Design a protein around this nucleic acid. Sequence first.
RNA 1: CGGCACGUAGCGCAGCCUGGUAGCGCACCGUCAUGGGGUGUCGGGGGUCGGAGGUUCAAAUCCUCUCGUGCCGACCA
RNA 2: CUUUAAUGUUUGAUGUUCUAACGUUGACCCGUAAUCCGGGUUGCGGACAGUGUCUGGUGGGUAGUUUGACUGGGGCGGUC
RNA 3: AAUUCCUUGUCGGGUAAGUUCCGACCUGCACGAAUGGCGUAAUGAUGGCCAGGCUGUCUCCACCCGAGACUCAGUGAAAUUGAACUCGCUGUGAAGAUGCAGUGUACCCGCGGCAAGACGGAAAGACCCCGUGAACCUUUACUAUAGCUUGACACUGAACA
RNA 4: GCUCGCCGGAAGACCAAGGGUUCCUGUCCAACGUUAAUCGGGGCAGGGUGAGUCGACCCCUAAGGCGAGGCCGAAAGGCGUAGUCGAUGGGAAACAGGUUAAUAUUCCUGUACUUGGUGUUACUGCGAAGGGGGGACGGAGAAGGCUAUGUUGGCCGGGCGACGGUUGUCCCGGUUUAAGCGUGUAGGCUGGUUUUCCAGGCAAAUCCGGAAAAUCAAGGCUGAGGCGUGAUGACGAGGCACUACGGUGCUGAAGCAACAAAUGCCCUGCUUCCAGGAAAAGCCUCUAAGCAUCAGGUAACAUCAAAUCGUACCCCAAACCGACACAGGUGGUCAGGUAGAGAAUACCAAGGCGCUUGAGAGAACUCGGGUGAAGGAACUAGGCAAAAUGGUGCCGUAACUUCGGGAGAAGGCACGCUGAUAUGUAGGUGAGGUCCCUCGCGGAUGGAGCUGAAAUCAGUCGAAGAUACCAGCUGGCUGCAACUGUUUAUUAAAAACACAGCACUGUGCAAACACGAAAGUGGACGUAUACGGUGUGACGCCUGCCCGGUGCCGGAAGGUUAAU
RNA 5: AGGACCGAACCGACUAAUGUUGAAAAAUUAGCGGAUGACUUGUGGCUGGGGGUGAAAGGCCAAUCAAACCGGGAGAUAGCU
Lengths: 271, 16, 46
Amino acid sequence: AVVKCKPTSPGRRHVVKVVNPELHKGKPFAPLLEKNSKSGGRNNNGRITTRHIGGGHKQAYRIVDFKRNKDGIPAVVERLEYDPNRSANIALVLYKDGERRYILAPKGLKAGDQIQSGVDAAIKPGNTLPMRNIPVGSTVHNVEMKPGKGGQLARSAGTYVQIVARDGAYVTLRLRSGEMRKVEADCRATLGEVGNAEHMLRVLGKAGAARWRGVRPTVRGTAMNPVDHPHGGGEGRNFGKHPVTPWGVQTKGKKTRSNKRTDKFIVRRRS
Amino acid sequence: TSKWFNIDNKIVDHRP
Amino acid sequence: MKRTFQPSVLKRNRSHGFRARMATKNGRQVLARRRAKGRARLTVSK
RNA sequence: CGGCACGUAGCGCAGCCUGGUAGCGCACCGUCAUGGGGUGUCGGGGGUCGGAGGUUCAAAUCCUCUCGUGCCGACCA
RNA sequence: CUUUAAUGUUUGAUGUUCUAACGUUGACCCGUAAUCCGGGUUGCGGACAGUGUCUGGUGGGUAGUUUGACUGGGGCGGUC
RNA sequence: AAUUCCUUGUCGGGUAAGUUCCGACCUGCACGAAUGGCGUAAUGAUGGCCAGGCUGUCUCCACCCGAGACUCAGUGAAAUUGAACUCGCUGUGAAGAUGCAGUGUACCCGCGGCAAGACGGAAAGACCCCGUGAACCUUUACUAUAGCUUGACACUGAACA
RNA sequence: GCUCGCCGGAAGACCAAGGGUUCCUGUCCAACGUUAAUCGGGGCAGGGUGAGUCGACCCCUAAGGCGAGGCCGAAAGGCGUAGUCGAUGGGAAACAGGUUAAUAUUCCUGUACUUGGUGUUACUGCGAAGGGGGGACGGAGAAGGCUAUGUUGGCCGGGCGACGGUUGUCCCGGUUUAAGCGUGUAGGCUGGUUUUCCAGGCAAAUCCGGAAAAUCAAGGCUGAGGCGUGAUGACGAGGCACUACGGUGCUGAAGCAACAAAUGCCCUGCUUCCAGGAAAAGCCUCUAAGCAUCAGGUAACAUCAAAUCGUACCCCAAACCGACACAGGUGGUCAGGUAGAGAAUACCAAGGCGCUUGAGAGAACUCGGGUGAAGGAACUAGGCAAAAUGGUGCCGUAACUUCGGGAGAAGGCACGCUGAUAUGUAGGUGAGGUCCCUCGCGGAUGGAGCUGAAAUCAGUCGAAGAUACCAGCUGGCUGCAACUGUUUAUUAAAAACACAGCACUGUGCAAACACGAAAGUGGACGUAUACGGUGUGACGCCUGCCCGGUGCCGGAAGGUUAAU
RNA sequence: AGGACCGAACCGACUAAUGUUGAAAAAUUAGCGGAUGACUUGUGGCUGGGGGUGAAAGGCCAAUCAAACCGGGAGAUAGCU
Ligand SMILES: N[C@@H](Cc1c[nH]c2ccccc12)C(=O)O
Ligand SMILES: [Mg+2]
Ligand SMILES: [Mg+2]
Ligand SMILES: [Mg+2]
Ligand SMILES: [Mg+2]
Ligand SMILES: [Mg+2]
Ligand SMILES: [Mg+2]
Ligand SMILES: [Mg+2]
Ligand SMILES: [Mg+2]
Ligand SMILES: [Mg+2]
Ligand SMILES: [Mg+2]
Ligand SMILES: [Mg+2]
Ligand SMILES: [Mg+2]
Ligand SMILES: [Mg+2]
Ligand SMILES: [Mg+2]
Ligand SMILES: [Mg+2]
Ligand SMILES: [Mg+2]
Ligand SMILES: [Mg+2]
Ligand SMILES: [Mg+2]
Ligand SMILES: [Mg+2]
Ligand SMILES: [Mg+2]
Ligand SMILES: [Mg+2]
Ligand SMILES: [Mg+2]
Ligand SMILES: [Mg+2]
Ligand SMILES: [Mg+2]
Ligand SMILES: [Mg+2]
Ligand SMILES: [Mg+2]
Ligand SMILES: [Mg+2]
Ligand SMILES: [Mg+2]
Ligand SMILES: [Mg+2]
Ligand SMILES: [Mg+2]
Ligand SMILES: [Mg+2]
Ligand SMILES: [Mg+2]
Ligand SMILES: [Mg+2]
Ligand SMILES: [Mg+2]
Ligand SMILES: [Mg+2]
Ligand SMILES: [Mg+2]
Ligand SMILES: [Mg+2]
Ligand SMILES: [Mg+2]
Ligand SMILES: [Mg+2]
Ligand SMILES: [Mg+2]
Ligand SMILES: [Mg+2]
Ligand SMILES: [Mg+2]
Ligand SMILES: [Mg+2]
Ligand SMILES: [Mg+2]
Ligand SMILES: [Mg+2]
Ligand SMILES: [Mg+2]
Ligand SMILES: [Mg+2]
Ligand SMILES: [Mg+2]
Ligand SMILES: [Mg+2]
Ligand SMILES: [Mg+2]
Ligand SMILES: [Mg+2]
Ligand SMILES: [Mg+2]
Ligand SMILES: [Mg+2]
């Protein structure tokens, strides 16, 4: 449920929170936590190497089973949890052999539903399966790229992939990016869209909202002197340069993909 | 070191 | 106002102490020069 | 004011550079339509070349004297 | 001891297939109670990718420099 | 107009009087639509203008209470300084004279006050030019170069077409 | 020594950090002290730091560091695995009083406790560098319960007043007491117990986890405080002695109750919200290899061990950072009375100070304050500075507005003291007595005693009752920037930066991109609702034309073109 | 509930006067802003010199910054004083 806020102060006036009532209020499943500890955007050389990163709230790491090996055994989703480490929500699971795990949380989620992995397994939201064994056209979320590797495609809130074809030992997928990429078919791929979806609609509303998600301010090119950055000086705004990144390569259209090792796999690039 | 008036620009610059 | 020297022995030793000095080829050359110079306090330690 | 560019038929540019002819657009004017106009088919006319002449067979040109006009600068303190 | 053409070759261009160099920031095994490395099995990729030498392009991202003199101050103009 | 040179443009308003201000006009020297256009409640130690209150801000300054300034005792600095027996004026003069000429004036020495002069002190003038000076910054200046990118040969093989 | 004055959320008190003998006592005054100096944080000499329990060492780990092998690198070296280090966090245990000139939770008196070794006596499956549990965690808010703590009365001791009065409804003072042990309350959390079975917890497990039943529901953790004990103890107003006049001994009353009451505790609770809130060990439990009379394990009592190092003094400062005995900077802890919302503010207590030149003068001028006839911004670049406003309740309040605001708009009225309502009320607290009972720190009823606002009526003093301190000036038009925020440490706080929102663009993950000869690392234990880059900058209405230039994207033709 | 309101501690540094051989190599006094947050603070850690860091001023990197400090090349060179 997306909800506007009443302007009892500027910087609430514009806020729009997503309230999920059916999300577990209270502490998460203790033994699937490990410390995360913040990066400050910094290298093992101490050198800021990705800018604009710092502070933010503390965040304990939920494990999350991306691979989905427990084939055969079924599980029941105890509850839905909030995860600070991602856009999506996670569902605490409980397989029948008494074991608990963390799955993502496809659009259906809802406590009490029944999940299962493996070549058998019902075609139904939440069940993982080699795409060898998922019917072309399904809407399959968190997808493996190398069979057995992990699951790396479409894990963000509301995302999904569309299987469109499957000649040979390969499948062609339709990634949200609109790309068309071939993938080994033997790859796992959990069924359905991933949740929240509404995530898109929050509005944050003030400076702090950004800071306390660990995002630091972005300082424009042309707000700095020549030595700092290819942009501006000027005695008054001024530009007169093709736009570039602070290291001189152009933004505004220059592709910068160079791979070859993996070009075999891309059928059609996005637009 | 230096006296403050010598360092200060308004008194020092005086005739340009 | 708060001035530049804010003393703290832990930091002192960790940054300038004998062992710290000893932990690097150049840190060692530091001592070597001071020994050759015949300095009475190689590195201001306990 | 000074720098430097140009006024060219009613009006605005070419031709100048690399001396000559002076063109072209639409307008003016006449024919011809149409009842008449406008338009237009269609015929002719229109420039001391901004003023001026030294070079020279030949000067709008190049050069020199010169007029306003436009444009660039009268800034560092 | 041939051009109008084709069987055996030594040799380029393109296209398919293979595995055996090479990659694997898939999986499993051992060193080993170890997310490093190595060995091993295997799947994937495969003479590509990547790298060395050479080479055309791009290259203020970075560096070293040049950017005249006269002049009734200097600049602009002009001059040489 | 944070843009208007001409410019205090012109008209309206406010004032006894308004180069600012508010409202207009459009002749925009030289606004204009994400190097965003036009608006905008709220917010602002933000800029401009107005009014009530308020007053020593002013007419124009008076008195008072405290801390210095002054006197005694104790302690005891500083910058500057070629050397000094270190006046006014008019003139001369490296061109703005305590020091030269002429002349006027002035018994010797403190203390408290004041800053017109010693081109007062302080800093080998920023500013101006100069040096075949420096540095950082810019770019379609010059020559190179990391990076990116291209092909050839090597690592590098087998087939069949 | 007697006055006087100043701080009292400090200018009192305890530390950490830092200093490193500045502590205490004698002695000296040359130099140090902005003066003198008999005095000192100064010279000289002597003294002084006592711990099983405080702290370090120690066990445990965060960030991060180091890193056998290892990967990488012309050399130097780089990164990193196993590990090993690293507190700013976790980990067993002592309190009240006394004493030294100088330390004391360390010494002494009283009264305790922690963990191991050994022994005795009972009773028993013990056992990991391993599993599980626990330790273990955010922000805001809301009260209830309670202590510190205060006030009054009672109680105790003392007083009868330098000046009219004070035998009383009068004055002054004190009225303090711990850990530990017992009790397990207000109140928080949670259904217990048995049997069987199981793809999980790398092996194992009786533990944890999951599935069934079966049976009673009251069981179990957690837990401030109170109460009892500790305690015939201690402390104690005040007394009497002597003192080398600094002090030092001795003795010693009452030691209850009521009301109020924290920001402390219960509370690591409870409620709620999004930004979703360390780790590891100690501890508990589980078993594997292994040991089975043994060894070990559990309990009672007895006994032994607990080393080493720190402990003086300053610590918002004359002892630390500031070259100074420098108006500056310096983290944590404690926190009384009267008024007050208050840790504001004013006056005080405990306690601590008067700032290391003074003495006189009563000029100009300068600094800091007070008052001012009439005028009231005429000042000036500009109301710069001053002046004014200033509290609480009620009444009342415009354009405009994103419907919250604008708003404390603006502007009114009341305000002290006395009596009455009511010898003290509404309210708060709450003992007796009576009944109930799983008898308790229970509950019900009960209303003494205590505490006690605000209102109104009547009256009354001053020029004045929000009387000091403290404590908004208000309104109109307009530029800019939405807003809170950030910035040139030391002439610029703004219209600059940032911002949420917007758009373009890159990036398919061994991502783009960045640090890096490389290994590797960040991006991210993220995956296109993601991430980088660039411009714009809440919101409202919107964002027109031009691809010739320069750039970027696409383009399997052809022309020109490198090594070879 | 709030980058909500008034206001101490705490954090800031808009105005003025004083001070300018200061009490002070950047403070004092009176006013001023924020004051549950993009807050503020103790301890400890990491980032290194054409490099760091930078809500961006060429700011800060030990009273030093359009390229820190220390030593070295070194008696750089100086058609200038
Ligand atoms: N305190 C000086 C100001 C100042 C200090 N350092 C300076 C250096 C340069 C100029 C001025 C200063 C004053 O009297 O105003
Ligand atoms: Mg941004
Ligand atoms: Mg800008
Ligand atoms: Mg700038
Ligand atoms: Mg400028
Ligand atoms: Mg600038
Ligand atoms: Mg411009
Ligand atoms: Mg260059
Ligand atoms: Mg050179
Ligand atoms: Mg010249
Ligand atoms: Mg204007
Ligand atoms: Mg631009
Ligand atoms: Mg602001
Ligand atoms: Mg004297
Ligand atoms: Mg004279
Ligand atoms: Mg005199
Ligand atoms: Mg004077
Ligand atoms: Mg000079
Ligand atoms: Mg000493
Ligand atoms: Mg002493
Ligand atoms: Mg003396
Ligand atoms: Mg001494
Ligand atoms: Mg450790
Ligand atoms: Mg080694
Ligand atoms: Mg390492
Ligand atoms: Mg510690
Ligand atoms: Mg003591
Ligand atoms: Mg025994
Ligand atoms: Mg564990
Ligand atoms: Mg009590
Ligand atoms: Mg009497
Ligand atoms: Mg009493
Ligand atoms: Mg002590
Ligand atoms: Mg002193
Ligand atoms: Mg001091
Ligand atoms: Mg106070
Ligand atoms: Mg003094
Ligand atoms: Mg005096
Ligand atoms: Mg008056
Ligand atoms: Mg006026
Ligand atoms: Mg005037
Ligand atoms: Mg005036
Ligand atoms: Mg003012
Ligand atoms: Mg005042
Ligand atoms: Mg702003
Ligand atoms: Mg400044
Ligand atoms: Mg400022
Ligand atoms: Mg984007
Ligand atoms: Mg802007
Ligand atoms: Mg606020
Ligand atoms: Mg406030
Ligand atoms: Mg500095
Ligand atoms: Mg020299
Ligand atoms: Mg040399």
